[PDB]
Amino acid sequence: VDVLDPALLRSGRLDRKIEFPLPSEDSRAQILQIHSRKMTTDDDINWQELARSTDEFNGAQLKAVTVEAGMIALRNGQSSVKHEDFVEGISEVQARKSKSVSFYA
Amino acid sequence: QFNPYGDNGGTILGIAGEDFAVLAGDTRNITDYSINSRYEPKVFDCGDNIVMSANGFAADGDALVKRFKNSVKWYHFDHNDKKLSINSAARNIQHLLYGKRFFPYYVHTII
Amino acid sequence: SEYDRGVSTFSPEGRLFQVEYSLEAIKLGSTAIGIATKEGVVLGVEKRATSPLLESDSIEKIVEIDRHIGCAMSGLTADARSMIEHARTAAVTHNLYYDEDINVESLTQSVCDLALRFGEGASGEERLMSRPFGVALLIAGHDADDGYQLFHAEPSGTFYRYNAKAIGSGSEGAQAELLNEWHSSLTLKEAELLVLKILKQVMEEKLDENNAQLSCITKQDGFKIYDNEKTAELIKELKEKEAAE
Amino acid sequence: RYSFSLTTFSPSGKLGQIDYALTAVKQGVTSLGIKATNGVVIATEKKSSSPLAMSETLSKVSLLTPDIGAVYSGMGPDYRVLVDKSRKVAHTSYKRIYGEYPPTKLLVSEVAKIMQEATQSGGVRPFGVSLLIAGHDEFNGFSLYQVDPSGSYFPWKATAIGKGSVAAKTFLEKRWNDELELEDAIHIALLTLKESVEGEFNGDTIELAIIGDENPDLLGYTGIPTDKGPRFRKLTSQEINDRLEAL
Amino acid sequence: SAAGYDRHITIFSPEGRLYQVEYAFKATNQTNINSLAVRGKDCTVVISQKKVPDKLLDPTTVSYIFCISRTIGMVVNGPIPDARNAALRAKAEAAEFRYKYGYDMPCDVLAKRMANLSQIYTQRAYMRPLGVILTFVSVDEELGPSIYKTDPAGYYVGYKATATGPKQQEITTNLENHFKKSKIDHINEESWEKVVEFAITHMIDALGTEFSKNDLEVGVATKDKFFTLSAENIEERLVAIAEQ
Amino acid sequence: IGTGYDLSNSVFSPDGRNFQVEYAVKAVENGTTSIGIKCNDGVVFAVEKLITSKLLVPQKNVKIQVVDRHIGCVYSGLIPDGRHLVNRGREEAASFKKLYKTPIPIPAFADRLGQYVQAHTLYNSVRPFGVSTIFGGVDKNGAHLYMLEPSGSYWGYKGAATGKGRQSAKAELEKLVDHHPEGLSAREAVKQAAKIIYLAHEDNKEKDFELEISWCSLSETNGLHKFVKGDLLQEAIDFAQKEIN
Amino acid sequence: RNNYDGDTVTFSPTGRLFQVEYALEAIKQGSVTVGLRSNTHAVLVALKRNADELSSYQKKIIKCDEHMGLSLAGLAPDARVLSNYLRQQCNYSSLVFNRKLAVERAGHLLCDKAQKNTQSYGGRPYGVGLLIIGYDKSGAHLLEFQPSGNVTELYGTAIGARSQGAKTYLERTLDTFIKIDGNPDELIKAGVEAISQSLRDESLTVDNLSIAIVGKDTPFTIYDGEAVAKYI
Amino acid sequence: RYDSRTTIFSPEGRLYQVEYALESISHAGTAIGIMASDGIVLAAERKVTSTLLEQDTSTEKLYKLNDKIAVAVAGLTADAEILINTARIHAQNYLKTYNEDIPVEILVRRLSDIKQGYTQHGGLRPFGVSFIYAGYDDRYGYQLYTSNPSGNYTGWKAISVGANTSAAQTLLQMDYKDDMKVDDAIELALKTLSKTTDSSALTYDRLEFATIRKGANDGEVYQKIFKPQEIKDILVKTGIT
Secondary structure, rough: OOOOOOHHHHHHHHHHHOOOHHHHHHHHHHHHHHHHOOOOOOOOHHHHHHHOOOOOOHHHHHHHHHHHHEEEEEEHHHOOHHHHHHHOHHHHHOOOOOOOOOOOO | OOOOOOOOOOOOEEOOOOOOOOEEEEOEEEEEEEEEEOOOOOOOOOOOOOOEEEEEEEHHHHHHHHHHHHHHHHHHOOOOOOOOOOOHHHHHHHHHHHHOOOOOOOOOEEO | OOOOOOOOOOOOEEEEEHHHHOOOOOOOOOOOOEEEEOOEEEEEOOOOOOOOOOOOOOOOOEOOOOOOOOEEEOOHHHHHHHHHHHHHEEEEEEHHOOOOOOOOHHHHHHHHHOOOOOOOOOOOOOOOOOOOOEEEEEEEEEOOOOOOOEEEOOOOEEEEEEEEEHHHHHOOHHHHHOOOOOOOEEEEEEEEHHHHHHHHHHHOOOOOOOOEEEEEEEEEEEEEEEOOOHHHHHHHHHHHHHHHO | OOOOOOOOOOOOOOOOOHHHHHHHHHHOOOOOEEOOOEEEEEEEEEEOOOOOOOOOOOOOOOOEEEEEEEEEEOOOHHHHHHHHHHHHHHHHHHOOOOOOOHHHHHHHHHHHHHHHHHHHHEEEEOOOOEEEEEEEOOOOOEOOOOHHHHHEEEEEEEEEEEEOOHHHHHHHHHHHOOOOOOHHHHHHHHHHHOOOOOOOOOOOOEEEEEEEEOOOOOOOOOOOOOOOOOOEEEOOOOHHHHHOOOO | OOOOOOOOOOOOOOOOOHHHHHHHHOOOOOOOOEEEEEEEEEEEEEEEEOOOOOOEEEOOOOOOOOEEOOOEEEEEEOHHHHHHHHHHHHHHHHHHHHHHHHOOOOOHHHHHHHHHHHHHHEOOOOOOOOOOOOEEEEOOOOOEEEEEOOOOOOOOEEEEEEEEOOOOOHHHHHHHHHHHOOOOOOOOOOOOOHHHHHHHHHHHHHHHOOOOOOOOEEEHHHHHHEOOHHHHHHHHHHHHOOOE | OOOOOOOOOOOOOOOOHHHHHHHHHHHHHHOOOEEEEEEEEEEEEEEEEOOOOOHHHHHHHHOOOOEOOOEEEEEEHHHHHHHHHHHHHHHHHHHHHHHOOOOOOOOHHHHHHHHHOOOOOOOOOOOOOOEEEEEEEOOOOEEEEEEEOOOOOEEEEEEEEEEHHHHHHHHHHHHHHHHHHHHHHOHHHHHHHHHHHHHHHHOEEEEEEEEEEEEEEEEOOOEEEEEEEHHHHHHHHHHHHHHHO | OOOOOOOOOOOOOOOOOOHHHHHHHHHHHHHHHHEEEEOOOOEEEOOOOOOOOOOOOOEEEEEOOOEEEOOOEEEEHHHHHHHHHHHHHHHHHHHHHOOOHHHHHHHHHHHHHHHHHHHOOOOOOOOOEEEEEEEEOOEEEEEEEOOHHHHHHHEEEEEEEOHHHHHHHHHHHHHHHHHOOOOOOHHHHHHHHHHHOOOOOOOOOOOEEEEEEEEEEEEOEEEEHHHHHOOO | OOOOOOOOOOOOOOOHHHHHHHHHHHOOOEEEEEEEEEEEEEEEEEEOOOOOOOOOOOOOOOOEEEOOOOEEEOOOOOHHHHHHHHHHHHHHHHHHHHHHOOHHHHHHHHHHHHHHHHHHOOOOOOOEEEEEEEEEEEEOEEEEEEOOOOEEEEEEOOEEEEHHHHHHHHHHHHOOOOOOHHHHHHHHHHHHHHHHHOOOOEEEEEEHEEEEEEOOOOOOOOEOOHHHHHHHHHHHHHHOO
16 A cells, blocks of 8 residues: 555545455464365364464465375375474465474474 | 481381391480370381381481381392392481481481 | 674574584585494594595594594594594593593594684683684494483584484495495494495595404404504405495 | 774774764854963863753753863763763872872873773773863873873863864964963953853853962862862852953 | 764763753653642642553552651652652752751751762763753741752752642642732631642643542641651542532 | 654653653553542552463452551552562551651552652663552551552542543542442441442453452551451452342 | 564564473474373383384383383483483482482472573473373372473373373373272273373383382382283 | 674674774874883874963973873873873882882783773773873883783884874884984974974974983983973974974
């Protein structure tokens, strides 16, 4: 909206400006579930656990996590998704590597 | 003034056998012309098959026993559960006794 | 990236970057191999001669810590000077306090406690080292109630017991061979020649006694640093072994 | 980039914190000093930006010791501490070593020395002010000195500092003589200062004091003729009025 | 502008004045209250407004006027945190002066040691300046009624009357016109009570708003003593105004 | 608002605020609802403790603590930040018992606490506290209840609230004050304390809660602090359930 | 945002600290351990890692005292420090008060330690979660330590990498194992069942198990090898 | 860059801070020591002037540290003040301890060490002062050194530090001789100063002077800061006035 033209907002030429924030914790829990429905769905998945972990994530970013969870699961050949797969789907959509052993791992 | 020590009598005795070894002592504790107590263990097991008796002046002796007791636990924690030898113990106690030297313990110890 | 300059100080993964970077100092260094056997632990090292004016056997990469605890080293010898001194003191005070030969496991922990000081101030042990150390050790010895052990001290303050462990540049390659070459039934002459077989492959120059320096922990001999005459004899026997094959 | 430590020098040399401190000084009030051969007159003007505020409450002319007074130009808060620290060092270093107040030359060095420390540390800022210190001692005569937030001191016959400095300075250059009375020096002083402001110039708001010859009046004790009264004397408004009327 | 050094009170501007020290003079309008103090002819009165926006607060703990020591008041404008710390320091200083030097600490000596303390907070970088204007009131052992306003820079200057707050300028002009027309520097009323009444009259005029006995807190210095008045003693004064 | 001024907790903004100190208040918002109800003969504290995983042991984790033995404290915000603040409150109270040989006045307590928050907003290597602490009790001058904000600001209260459900919590709290001019009797202010937190738990509907109520009463605890337990707590639960439907 | 993550003494707008959240992430990145307990016994069961198969493992169970002991998950450096300090507290209790230090008090001192470095400049949130067990007068307790310093009493919890499968399992049997009492063996059994589901692409070995038990009439003991091969 | 601390180094192994601190000394007035084998003369130029500046009753860049060694000052005066006081204490401390006055070589070494320390250690400025040392001690006779702000020293038979360093040094070595004379040395400082300075008057009010001689009396050593009216008198003789 910084790029947006100032004279369009100026005065009561256009009224009511509505800002959509980042999803809340509440909103994140709902967004993963709905997408999951389309693939295989298991109730060992605790969706609250996932919503806490993600920080600064959009709904776009979460659709990719749902799809990714499906990519890792197919790769292994497990025809039924786990919660484990899902947790490994946060760190391959993000550019980080959590797959690298350390000095305590 | 103050007297930082006094005395508390008693007799302790160590006899070393050749596969059993005995550390004995009286349970009478006295001060001056009172018998304070009939019964009172002064020979204390410390674990790892080590008995310790520290007899003289009660203040000095009970405190030293207690301080050694703490060490045996510290030894298992930092040395991953290594038993203490009697001779190794004998050396630990030298460093406990000399560790105050300008207000020293004033009990004759036998382990 | 942008989370790495400090030592306090994280890190979206959760790791201390400064600590992980010191791992990479160890690969800069010259290859050192150790192999525990049930007859003793052999600590061989590589030395590298920048000029054939650097006097090989006046550079020390194996050092004596006590009469029963030894170390080999790799990485910065600036950091190894403080690192080693600490441990030499640990063994000498342990003999003073308890008369008993320091246990290898506890001797490692003393090194690694000192490794832990990173910060410039903490609760508990009061931090007074301004950075992690830049040196690993292989720690070898023999205690009486657990026999021969070979440990690797890390500059990150963690200790892994090993049957065999390599550090230095040639760490990856040695480690690959030793996966195919350790046994329960190996012997100390066998160990000695095992270290050299692995060593020639991971040295950039060639195998000479000038550029090698093996040593043993045997209960009988105690800690014995060898000579080059000794080391040369072993080299000549490696070459014989590989000839037949 | 060389501006904002005290630790960073420019490529051309010098430190910025000292340079920026000098800027600060020049924003402060117009104060001036003229050395005479039988005195020193030190003078400043005052304000409060509200008439409700009383003008004796402020003191911009303060005796540092009984024989040595001082003024400033620059930030108000910084003066008040630095004068406390100066009186306190005056006793430590010299009123226990002579058992009385130090000579003028000495004490210039000691105050200049607190400045030097407020530059030396980093994360401690210089002081915001430049002092004139004038005093009298028994071996170098009457004297005048400038003590800069730099931690450098400069001896002066006449100088001015503060907002009206550049104009006051050229008026002083012309009008000064090598031999003046205490009385004539006061008249050159009130007049110089009247360059800086007109129509709000009165003796009430102008603080003007001297280090002249001993006064037995402010000695406070009598019968001991082997010690001298305060060389410093603060003049009142009504007395400044006699001199301003007489112009 | 900006760059360094609105981040530091130990690093000067090219202006020569510290920008963060100036922000403490913009942090003094934070609680939106105004103070008035005037001098009588053996008393000092100081009155600052009370805001109790919700019935949850108890108007007896909502105050800005403090008892600093037996003879010394203070009213604070600006935030509660720096108000407590300043008040504490002052309480400690007042108390200390006595064992060292004997008698009750004059308004002037307290104000000056707190001003010098504010200047030190700006000297060092490891301490920030305070965020309050302190207006101290006492009747002095030998100088009688005295008001000294000490600002959070470390500047201190006395007064015949002073006002502080965001609506200050209006009270200040109100006072200029008053003290100028009388041709004196004091209020010539000879009891503490008719000086409290006059002060009430003048704050009502300047701001332009009727206030209540739950919106005033009034502290009164007489010689040798200081007290803060409760709401029901404050009403007596109000009903005196409301029909003369 | 703008860039900078946040970062460091002693930098003053061009707005006359200190942003870092505000940002703390925002952290306290996220915490679990707490209220204090002052009385004419007691104080009541009640708190909303969420149970977020059902493997938790019931009635065993609390954000209620006692201080000395006469003053109740309960905090919102970040839990372990809140434990440290009550902890320094115990040292101060305890110091007070040796020097002056009397229980702390509740206003005396408030002064000491208010200074500690002010000091951790006063440097550049300390951290501003991210907690409110409702606390008080009953002492020599009758009942007093105070609330300390993470800005280092405090006041007395006839009703205090902090937490998530704090807007709902203030609406009911005001009502209490108007229907009850005496300020509500302490016994019935326990039953009332339960109901107000039940209404606040509808802004947090997703998670279960456990109701812990404690008090301090001149009349019904002999001026001592103690928790509300057994049948008494049961009544408070039953009353609250009733009036919400 | 993500720029306030530079240090621990600085807050974010919504109010967090990114460093504490990061220390938290680290627990997951390390080791896995699953804790559970009963009215009569407390048991920790944990997976030990090794760098490679010439490595012979690194123990995760630290005997604190003969009535207290802990497991670790995350940074091994961090852990060595907190355990040493805790051991100091038990000996202190013994020395001066003659008392087996209560599990409830103990976690709170641990919490106090944690917060020192969170406030201060220098230091760092401790990079490890710990599950502390003990059996005192008030029976078994099991505590969950966090990098924030919050200490949480549970019947059963699990932390570390992919530990949620143990938590789903424990949840299912919760009340089942609470009833199990006077039988140490069966609590070891349940515990092996919980950490199995968590694992995936690895299964148990003799040297991966370290089972740590304290109960009613037994001290703290760390079992290894041929004392965990009845529950392999 | 690698300005930002003083405890850093640069990709070339320079340190910008040591260079910058060095250039500070060419901002402040000329200072000249010329050693001759019949005395050392110290001469210095002022860097401040005006008809109401007092400079006709005072020295401020000739300090006797002790009673046989003195320095000329070039660089910042604030920086200069502290190190002059430290230097005088250590020179004189030796006096107390050993009951004979400090040798020239040791005192310059000491003060250079203090200089160096501000670069080596802490988060402090280096000290931007170049002191020309002129002493006598009976081990090497007459000794001329100057110390760099880097904090090292080298002996000299003539040196010039302070403003216009390069120009002055060229001027001095054209007309200098090894045999020399103390009286020819005074005339040489006055010769060099006319050219180097940007003031064409070059009168007494701008000039400081001290000559240190052992030819002054016999068996005895005399440090004489000249007074302002002698400085005038010698300007006629060299003909500049």
